[PDB]
PDB file of C-alpha atoms and ligand atoms in Angstrom:
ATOM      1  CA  UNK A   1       0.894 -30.431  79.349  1.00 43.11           C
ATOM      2  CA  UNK A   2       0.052 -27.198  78.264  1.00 43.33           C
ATOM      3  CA  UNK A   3      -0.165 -28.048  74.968  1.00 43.85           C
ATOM      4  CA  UNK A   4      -3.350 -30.462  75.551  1.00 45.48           C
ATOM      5  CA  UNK A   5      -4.910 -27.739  77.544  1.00 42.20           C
ATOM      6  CA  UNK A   6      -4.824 -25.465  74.859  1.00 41.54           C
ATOM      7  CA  UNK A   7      -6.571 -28.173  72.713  1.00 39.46           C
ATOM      8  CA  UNK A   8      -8.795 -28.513  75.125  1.00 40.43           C
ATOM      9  CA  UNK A   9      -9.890 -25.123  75.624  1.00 39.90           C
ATOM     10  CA  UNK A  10     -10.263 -25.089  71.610  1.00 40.93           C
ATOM     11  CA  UNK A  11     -12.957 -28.133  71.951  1.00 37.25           C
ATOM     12  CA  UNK A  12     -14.423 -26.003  74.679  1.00 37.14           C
ATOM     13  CA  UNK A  13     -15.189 -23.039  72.524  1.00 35.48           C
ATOM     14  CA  UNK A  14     -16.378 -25.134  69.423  1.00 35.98           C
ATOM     15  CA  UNK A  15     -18.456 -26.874  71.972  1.00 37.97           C
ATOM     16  CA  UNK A  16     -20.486 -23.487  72.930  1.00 37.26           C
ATOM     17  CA  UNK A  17     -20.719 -21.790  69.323  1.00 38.17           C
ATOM     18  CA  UNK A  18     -21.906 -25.237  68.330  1.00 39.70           C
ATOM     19  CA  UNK A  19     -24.704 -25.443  71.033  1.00 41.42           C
ATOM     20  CA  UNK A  20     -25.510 -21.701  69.744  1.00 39.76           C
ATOM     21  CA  UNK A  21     -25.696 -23.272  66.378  1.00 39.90           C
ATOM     22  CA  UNK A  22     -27.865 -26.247  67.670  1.00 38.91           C
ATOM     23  CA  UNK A  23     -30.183 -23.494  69.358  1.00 39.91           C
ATOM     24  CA  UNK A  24     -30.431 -21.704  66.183  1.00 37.63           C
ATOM     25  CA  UNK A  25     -31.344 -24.904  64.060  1.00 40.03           C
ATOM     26  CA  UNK A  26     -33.292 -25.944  66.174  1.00 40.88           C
ATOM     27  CA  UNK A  27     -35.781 -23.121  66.574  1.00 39.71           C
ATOM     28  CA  UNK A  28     -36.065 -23.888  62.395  1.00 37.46           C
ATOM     29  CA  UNK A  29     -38.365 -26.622  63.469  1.00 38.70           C
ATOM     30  CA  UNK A  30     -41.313 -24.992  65.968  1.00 38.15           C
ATOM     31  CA  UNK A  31     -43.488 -27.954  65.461  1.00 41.69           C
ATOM     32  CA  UNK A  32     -40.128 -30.322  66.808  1.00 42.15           C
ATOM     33  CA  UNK A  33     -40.493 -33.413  64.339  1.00 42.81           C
ATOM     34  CA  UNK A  34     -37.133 -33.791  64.347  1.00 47.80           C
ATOM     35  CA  UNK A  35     -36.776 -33.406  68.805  1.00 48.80           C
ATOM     36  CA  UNK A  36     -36.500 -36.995  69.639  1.00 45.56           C
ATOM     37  CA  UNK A  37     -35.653 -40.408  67.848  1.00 45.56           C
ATOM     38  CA  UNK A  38     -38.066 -42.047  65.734  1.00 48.15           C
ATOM     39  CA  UNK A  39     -39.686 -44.106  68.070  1.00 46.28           C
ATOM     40  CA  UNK A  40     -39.199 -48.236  67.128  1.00 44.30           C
ATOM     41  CA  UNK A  41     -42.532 -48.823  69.661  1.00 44.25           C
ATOM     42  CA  UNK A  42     -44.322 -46.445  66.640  1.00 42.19           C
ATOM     43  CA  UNK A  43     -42.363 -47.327  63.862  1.00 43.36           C
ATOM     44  CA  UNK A  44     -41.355 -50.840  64.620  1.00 42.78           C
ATOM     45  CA  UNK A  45     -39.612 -51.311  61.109  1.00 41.12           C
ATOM     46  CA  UNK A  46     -37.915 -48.018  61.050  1.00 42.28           C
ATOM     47  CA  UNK A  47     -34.391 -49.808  61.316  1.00 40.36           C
ATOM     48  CA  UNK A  48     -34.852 -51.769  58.271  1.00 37.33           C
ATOM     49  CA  UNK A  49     -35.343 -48.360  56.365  1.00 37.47           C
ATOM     50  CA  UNK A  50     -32.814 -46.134  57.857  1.00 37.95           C
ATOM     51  CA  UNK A  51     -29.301 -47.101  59.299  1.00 41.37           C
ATOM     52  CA  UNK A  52     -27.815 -44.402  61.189  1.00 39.04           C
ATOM     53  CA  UNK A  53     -30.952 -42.935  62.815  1.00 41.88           C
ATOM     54  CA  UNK A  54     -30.330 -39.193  64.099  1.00 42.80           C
ATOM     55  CA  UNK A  55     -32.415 -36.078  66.196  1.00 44.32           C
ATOM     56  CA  UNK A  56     -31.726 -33.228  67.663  1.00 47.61           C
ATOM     57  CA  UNK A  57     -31.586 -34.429  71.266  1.00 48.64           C
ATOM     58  CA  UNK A  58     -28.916 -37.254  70.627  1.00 50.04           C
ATOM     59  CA  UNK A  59     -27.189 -34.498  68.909  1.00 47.64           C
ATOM     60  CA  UNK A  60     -27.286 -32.308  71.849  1.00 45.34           C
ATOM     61  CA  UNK A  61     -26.175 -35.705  74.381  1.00 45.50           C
ATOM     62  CA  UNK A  62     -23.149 -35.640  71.421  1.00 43.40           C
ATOM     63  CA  UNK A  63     -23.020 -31.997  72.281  1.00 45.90           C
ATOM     64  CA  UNK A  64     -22.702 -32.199  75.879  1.00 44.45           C
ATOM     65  CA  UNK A  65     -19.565 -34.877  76.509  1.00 43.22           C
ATOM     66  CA  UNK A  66     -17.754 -32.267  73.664  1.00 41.67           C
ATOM     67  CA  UNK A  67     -18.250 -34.988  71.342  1.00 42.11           C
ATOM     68  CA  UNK A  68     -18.133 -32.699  67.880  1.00 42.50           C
ATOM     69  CA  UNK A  69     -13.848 -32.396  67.341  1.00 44.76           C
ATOM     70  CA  UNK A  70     -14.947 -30.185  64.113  1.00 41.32           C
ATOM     71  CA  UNK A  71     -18.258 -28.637  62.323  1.00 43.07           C
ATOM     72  CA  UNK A  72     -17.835 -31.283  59.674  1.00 43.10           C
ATOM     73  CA  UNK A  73     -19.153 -33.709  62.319  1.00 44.60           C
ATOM     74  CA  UNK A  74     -21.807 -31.911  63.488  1.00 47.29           C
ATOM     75  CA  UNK A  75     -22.792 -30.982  59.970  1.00 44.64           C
ATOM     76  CA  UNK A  76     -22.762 -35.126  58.801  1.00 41.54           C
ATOM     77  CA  UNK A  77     -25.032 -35.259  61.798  1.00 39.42           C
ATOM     78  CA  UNK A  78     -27.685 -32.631  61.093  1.00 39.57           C
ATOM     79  CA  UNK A  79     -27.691 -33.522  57.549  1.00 42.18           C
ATOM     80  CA  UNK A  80     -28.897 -37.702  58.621  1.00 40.33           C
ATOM     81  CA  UNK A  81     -31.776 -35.842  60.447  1.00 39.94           C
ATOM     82  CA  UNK A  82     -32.707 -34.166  57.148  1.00 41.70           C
ATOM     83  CA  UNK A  83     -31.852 -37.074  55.066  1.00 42.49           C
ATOM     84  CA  UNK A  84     -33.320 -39.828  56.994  1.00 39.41           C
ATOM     85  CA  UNK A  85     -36.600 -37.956  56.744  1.00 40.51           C
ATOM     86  CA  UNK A  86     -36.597 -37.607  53.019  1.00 39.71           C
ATOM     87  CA  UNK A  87     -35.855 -41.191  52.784  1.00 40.70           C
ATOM     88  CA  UNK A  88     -38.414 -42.573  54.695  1.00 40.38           C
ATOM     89  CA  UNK A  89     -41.277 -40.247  54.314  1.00 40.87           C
ATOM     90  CA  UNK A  90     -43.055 -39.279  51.145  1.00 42.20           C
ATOM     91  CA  UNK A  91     -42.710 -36.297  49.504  1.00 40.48           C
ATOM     92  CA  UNK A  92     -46.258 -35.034  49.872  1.00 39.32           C
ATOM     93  CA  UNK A  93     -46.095 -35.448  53.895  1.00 41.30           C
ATOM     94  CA  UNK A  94     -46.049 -32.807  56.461  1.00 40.31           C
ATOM     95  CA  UNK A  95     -42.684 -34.378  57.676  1.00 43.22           C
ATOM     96  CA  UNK A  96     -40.607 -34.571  54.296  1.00 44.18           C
ATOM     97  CA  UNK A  97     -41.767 -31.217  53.862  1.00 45.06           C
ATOM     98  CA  UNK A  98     -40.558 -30.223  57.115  1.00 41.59           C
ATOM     99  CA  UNK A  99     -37.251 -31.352  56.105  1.00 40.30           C
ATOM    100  CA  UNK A 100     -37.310 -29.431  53.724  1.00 40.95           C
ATOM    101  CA  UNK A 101     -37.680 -26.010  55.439  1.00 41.87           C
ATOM    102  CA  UNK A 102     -35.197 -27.377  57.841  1.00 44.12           C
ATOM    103  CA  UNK A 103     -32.735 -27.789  55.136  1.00 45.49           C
ATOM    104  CA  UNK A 104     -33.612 -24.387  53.338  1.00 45.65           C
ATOM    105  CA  UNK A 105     -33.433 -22.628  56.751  1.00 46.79           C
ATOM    106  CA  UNK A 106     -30.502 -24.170  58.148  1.00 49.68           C
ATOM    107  CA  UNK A 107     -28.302 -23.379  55.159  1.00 51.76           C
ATOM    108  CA  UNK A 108     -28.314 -19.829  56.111  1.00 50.97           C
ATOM    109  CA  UNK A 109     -27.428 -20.424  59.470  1.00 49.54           C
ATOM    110  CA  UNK A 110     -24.506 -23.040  58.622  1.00 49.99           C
ATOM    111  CA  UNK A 111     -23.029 -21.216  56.047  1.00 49.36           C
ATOM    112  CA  UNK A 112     -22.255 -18.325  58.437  1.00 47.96           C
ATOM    113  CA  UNK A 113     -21.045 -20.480  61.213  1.00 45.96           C
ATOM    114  CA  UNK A 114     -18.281 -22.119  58.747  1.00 47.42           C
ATOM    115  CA  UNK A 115     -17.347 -18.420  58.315  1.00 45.46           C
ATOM    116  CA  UNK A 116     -16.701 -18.279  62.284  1.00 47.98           C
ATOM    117  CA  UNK A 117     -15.451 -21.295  63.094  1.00 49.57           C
ATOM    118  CA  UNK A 118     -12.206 -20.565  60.096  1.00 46.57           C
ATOM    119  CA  UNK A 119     -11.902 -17.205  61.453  1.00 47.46           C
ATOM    120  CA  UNK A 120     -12.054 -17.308  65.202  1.00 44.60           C
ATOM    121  CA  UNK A 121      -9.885 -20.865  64.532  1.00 47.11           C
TER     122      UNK A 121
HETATM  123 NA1   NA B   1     -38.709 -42.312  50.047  1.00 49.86          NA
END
């Protein structure tokens, strides 16, 4: 139908402001702590600690198959990387602190991409 077309060319265009917004969030973290999953060869316990385990690439694999239906999603997702990081590391560490700017940082560029995502619908 039509109608699902015109859905689907919605989830298309939240797709590429979202990868815009990855980009963006991304380039918040130069020294890329938060690139790849923990590793459970280096942190073999890391599961017992944190549940939902999150990073920027599996975000943009999420990205990719047009798996974000809103920004709420990718928001819950980008927060777990922040959150996860807080959790586990200690707050006088070059990664909690890291979070930390991410957060800060990322802010900014989320609450103007709310803003476009209500007004271009
Ligand atoms: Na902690």
């Amino acid at each position: 139908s039509m109608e699902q077309v015109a859905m689907e060319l919605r989830l298309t265009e939240l797709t590429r402001l979202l990868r815009s917004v990855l980009d963006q969030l991304q380039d918040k973290d130069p020294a890329r702590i938060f690139a790849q999953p923990v590793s459970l060869k280096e942190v073999p316990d890391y599961l017992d600690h944190i549940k939902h385990p999150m990073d920027f690439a599996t975000m943009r694999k999420r990205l990719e198959a047009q798996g974000y239906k809103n920004l709420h999603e990718f928001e819950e997702d980008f927060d777990l990387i922040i959150d996860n990081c807080m959790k586990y590391n200690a707050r006088d560490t070059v990664f909690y602190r890291a979070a930390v700017r991410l957060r800060d940082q990322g802010g900014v560029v989320l609450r103007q991409a709310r803003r476009e995502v209500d007004s271009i619908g």
